[PDB]
Amino acid sequence: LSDEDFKAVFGMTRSAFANLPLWKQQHLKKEKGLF
């Protein structure tokens, strides 16, 4: 995704998301059909 699309889809910035547990980063993304 682009950075703007990322923020819309996940409801936070990439930097914020990077603080989530790694396996979950995978969870919030696979659940959206993303990688």
Curated annotation (Swiss-Prot):
- Where is the stretch described as Absolutely required for activity? 29-32
Compartments where located: Cytoplasm, Cytoskeleton; Cell projection, Microvillus; Cell projection, Lamellipodium; Cell projection, Ruffle
* PTM notes: Phosphorylated on tyrosine residues. The unphosphorylated form increases the initial rate of actin-nucleating activity, whereas the tyrosine-phosphorylated form inhibits actin-nucleating activity, enhances actin-bundling activity and enhances actin-severing activity by reducing high Ca(2+) requirements. The tyrosine-phosphorylated form does not regulate actin-capping activity.
Disulfide links within the chain: none
Q: What is the effect of changing residue 23 to A?
A: Loss of F-actin binding
- What does the entry's domain section say? Consists of a large core fragment in the N-terminal portion and a small headpiece (HP) in the C-terminal portion. The core fragment is necessary for both actin-nucleating and -severing activities, whereas the HP binds F-actin strongly in both the presence and absence of calcium and is necessary in actin-bundling activity. The Gelsolin-like 1 repeat is necessary for the actin-capping activity. The entire core fragment is necessary for the actin-severing activity.
Description of how the protein assembles with itself and partners: Monomer. Homodimer. Associates with F-actin; the association with F-actin is inhibited by tropomyosin.
- Report the family membership: Belongs to the villin/gelsolin family.
Official protein name in the record? Villin-1
**Annotated source species:** Gallus gallus
